[PDB]
Amino acid sequence: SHMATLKVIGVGGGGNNAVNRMIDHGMNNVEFIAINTDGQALNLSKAESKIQIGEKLTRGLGAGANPEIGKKAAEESREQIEDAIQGADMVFVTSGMGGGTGTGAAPVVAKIAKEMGALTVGVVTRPFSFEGRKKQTQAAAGVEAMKAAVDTLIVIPNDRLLDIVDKSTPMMEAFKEADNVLRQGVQGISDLIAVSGEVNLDFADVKTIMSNQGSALMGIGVSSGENRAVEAAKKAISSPLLETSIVGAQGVLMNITGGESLSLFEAQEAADIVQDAADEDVNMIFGTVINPELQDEIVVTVIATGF
Ligand SMILES: Nc1nc2c(ncn2[C@@H]2O[C@H](COP(=O)(O)OP(=O)(O)O)[C@@H](O)[C@H]2O)c(=O)[nH]1
Ligand SMILES: [K+]
């Protein structure tokens, strides 16, 4: 029997913001690591494990939006980063691209985790257009460096947050919507590992769908009542925040969780929604979990790769 160790690593300001908000939300059976140049921010981190990088470089300040400083800071702290990761079977690295620390250090952190054998997933943001072309260009170079260093990468363009707010939505509420991509992905994988399914998926199946793949989609949908399976499957694959949509996916891990009423017909319906949306012949790794506590609720978890 195998119990996978999952860790979430925030790198730089935005990544450490995400870690703090996820801890506040509550996230058990997952270990958090906070990595930053900025000692003032790191002192406010809620993470159990904190690594200040580049103190000789920046004297405790941030990188001042220069990615070369973040890269050097991370490389010089490799051993400390390895020690915090040790034991991990899966590592999520989260960072905002475009600044100095995340852009430069997050790809180093990802490569360290990958060369320790952890399944390594990046979830990163691109800057708002109003932040200017230079920052977009720097972020683009960071995204490409992340893709070369992870097993799978999820990119959230911050511009998509402007598609989901009204004129009054607090910025922090919008940021929590972006956080949900990583948080619900981690939770869905943590639930998959913890529960034996009736059609069982385990961590080896997560590795099949995510190892050495590139772009990825991770989504969850919950629905009740009539047409719940179709509606949950549509919710799982249809986030407006994602650079990589479901279209073009050639591998999908899909788990359906329901009560004792979970029907074979509705499982096929949900699988068909995902196949049709990908517009490809999808290699599906299909799982089912009967949770008797659930009455009329159905949960559909999707991880899509192979773009
Ligand atoms: N969605 C989101 N984006 C953020 C957040 N914090 C910063 N950003 C974005 O991330 C980019 C880099 O900022 P930051 O992570 O603070 O820079 P760094 O510490 O030097 O890596 C910014 O230009 C913003 O686009 C956050 O909490 N949420
Ligand atoms: K399992």
Numbering used by the authors: 9 to 315
Sentences from the paper on this structure:
Interestingly, mutants Q48A and R143K supported assembly, forming polymers that are stabilized against disassembly by GTP consumption as compared to the wild-type protein. This correlates with reduced GTPase activity by about 6-fold in both mutants. In the structure of the R143K mutant, K143 occupies an equivalent position to that of R143 in the wild-type protein but its positive charge lies 3 Å further from the GDP α- and γ-phosphates. As the R143Q mutant is incompetent for polymerization and catalysis, our results indicate that a positively charged residue in this position is required for GTP hydrolysis. Second, we found that bottom residue R143, which connects to both D213 and the nucleotide γ-phosphate through bridging water B1, contributes to catalysis and that the position of its positive charge is critical for efficient GTP hydrolysis. Accordingly, R143K and not R143Q mutation allows assembly but presents reduced GTPase activity. The role of R143 is likely equivalent to that of the arginine finger in Ras-like GTPases, while in these enzymes, the finger residue contacts the nucleotide directly. The polymers formed by the Q48A and R143K mutants were mostly filamentous ribbons, rather than the bundles observed for the wild-type protein. While the wild-type protein forms rapidly depolymerizing, single and double, wavy filaments, Q48A and R143K form stabilized, straight, thin filaments that slowly evolve into filamentous ribbons.
FtsZ is an assembling GTPase that plays a key role during bacterial cell division. This widely conserved protein polymerizes in the presence of GTP and metal cations into polar filaments that gather at the center of dividing cells to form a dynamic Z-ring. First, GTP hydrolysis only occurs within the filament, as the complete catalytic site is formed at the interface between adjacent FtsZ monomers. We report a dozen filament structures of the FtsZ core (residues 12 to 316) from the pathogen S. aureus, hereafter SaFtsZ, in complex with various GTP mimetics and metal ions.
